[PDB]
Amino acid sequence: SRGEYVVAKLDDLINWARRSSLWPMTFGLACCAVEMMHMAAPRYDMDRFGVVFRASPRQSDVMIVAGTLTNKMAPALRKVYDQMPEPRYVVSMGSCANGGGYYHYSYSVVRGCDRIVPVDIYVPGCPPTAEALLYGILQLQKKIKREKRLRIWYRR
């Protein structure tokens, strides 16, 4: 089982490397944007976790979508989403964006970002507090711990 064990440790290596940093792009429409800038605050640091806020979309690993996503917003959202590399994850933050929520019975408003992008981490709250959002990002990293990607390529 020498090849299986060394490929398993190799998969652990690359999964640990991906779950290390994950510097996103911070999309941030409405007041959930202010809550993201306040989980950049000194009480809760992103940069303890390799998480650098940077709006460069070509080198963005995950993407937090938050704020009130509108029908006038959505095509530019998916055009941002296409030019983003295949290791990609979507964290839907906030009661506006994770299912419509408060502006749910309203024209020109997308009924949550399930209908636009594939969604990985739902985090509710209004605003979802920095503790809750940081808990969601650690749970995202534990999803990265449970991936078995290179094992599937091995026994494929």
Kindly identify the residues of this chain, within the stretch 94-123, that bind another protein according to CB under 8 A: 95, 98-109, 112, 114, 119-123
68, 110, 130, 134: which one binds ligand SF4 (CB under 6 A): 68
Q: Name the residue nearer to ligand SF4 (CB basis): 62 or 128.
A: 128
Closest C-alpha to 22, from 95, 85, 70, 83: 85
Query: Cβ neighbours of residue 142 under 8 Å, at least 6 residues apart?
Result: none
> Among residue numbers 23 through 52, which ones bind ligand SF4 (CB under 6 A)?
30-32
78, 126, 149, 152: which one binds another protein (CB under 8 A): 126
Among ligand SF4, another protein, none, what binds residue 70 when CB lies within 5 to 8 Å by partner kind? another protein
Interface with another protein includes 5 (CB under 8 A)? no
Interface with another protein includes 143 (CB under 8 A)? yes
Strand partners, 89: 62
DSSP notation for 114-142: GGTS---EEE--SS--HHHHHHHHHHHHH
Interface with ligand SF4 includes 60 (CB under 6 A)? no
Lookup: tokens for 145: 């711990």
The alpha-helical segments, DSSP class H, found in 1-100 are 2-20, 32-37, 74-82
Longest Cα separation, the chain = 59
Q: Name the residue nearer to another protein (CB basis): 24 or 67.
A: 67
> Among residue numbers 25 through 64, which ones bind another protein (CB under 8 A)?
29-31, 34-35, 37-38, 40-45, 47-50, 52, 56, 58-59
